[PDB]
Write a protein that binds this ligand. Structure first.
Ligand SMILES: [Mg+2]
Length: 198
């Protein structure tokens, strides 16, 4: 749905402050003062950025990240550190971290980061509802139709496909005429795009 930033910091200085700043910037805000609460009320199918403290009672920022990874939730993470005596990992950096901001932070860089995170979440999101519906469409094909696709996009003509499947040429006209309709294409050109964009 909407674009929310989920602030997960134990500190009231932060959860309120950020809740406020981000709201004074177009965003809804959902605040949690522990990771596990978050995990419970997280709905993977809900667009947004996660702004996440690293040191927290219970599951640390990193450990929370490890779960989101484990359940293939890809909410981009913008971590926020407090200390020098700990460097983030290569796994933490690979585990979809957008940015690391120190506490307290240049309010413009947080703002920078949360955008960059939102942009990427909406991109990783489109490229999954797009490619899903492009496989809902392909699902609706039967098995005889799927042989008539895999032969057409290969360049064959009605008669040859027939004299290649041992069916009536008229069967093929209908088979093709159906494929086009299931797949919502109206031009051979498209057919071979969809079918290539698998
Ligand atoms: Mg903390």
């Amino acid at each position: 749905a909407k674009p929310t930033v989920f602030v997960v910091d134990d500190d009231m200085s932060v959860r309120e402050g950020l809740r406020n700043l981000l709201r004074s910037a177009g965003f809804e805000v959902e605040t949690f003062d522990c990771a596990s609460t978050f995990l419970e009320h997280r709905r993977p199918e809900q667009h947004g950025c996660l702004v996440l403290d690293m040191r927290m009672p219970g599951m640390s920022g990193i450990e929370l990240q490890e779960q989101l990874t484990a359940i293939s939730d890809g909410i981009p993470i913008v971590f926020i550190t407090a200390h020098g005596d700990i460097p983030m990992t290569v796994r933490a950096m690979k585990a979809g971290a957008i940015e690391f901001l120190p506490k307290p932070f240049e309010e413009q860089a947080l703002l920078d980061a949360i955008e960059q995170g939102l942009q990427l979440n909406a991109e990783r999101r489109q490229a999954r509802e797009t490619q899903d519906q492009l496989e809902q469409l392909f699902s609706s094909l039967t098995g005889r139709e799927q042989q008539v696709l895999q032969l057409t996009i290969r360049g064959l003509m009605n008669k040859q496909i027939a004299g290649e499947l041992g069916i009536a040429e008229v069967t093929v006209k209908v088979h093709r005429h159906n494929i086009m309709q299931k797949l919502n294409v109206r031009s051979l050109a498209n057919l071979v795009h969809l079918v290539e964009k698998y």
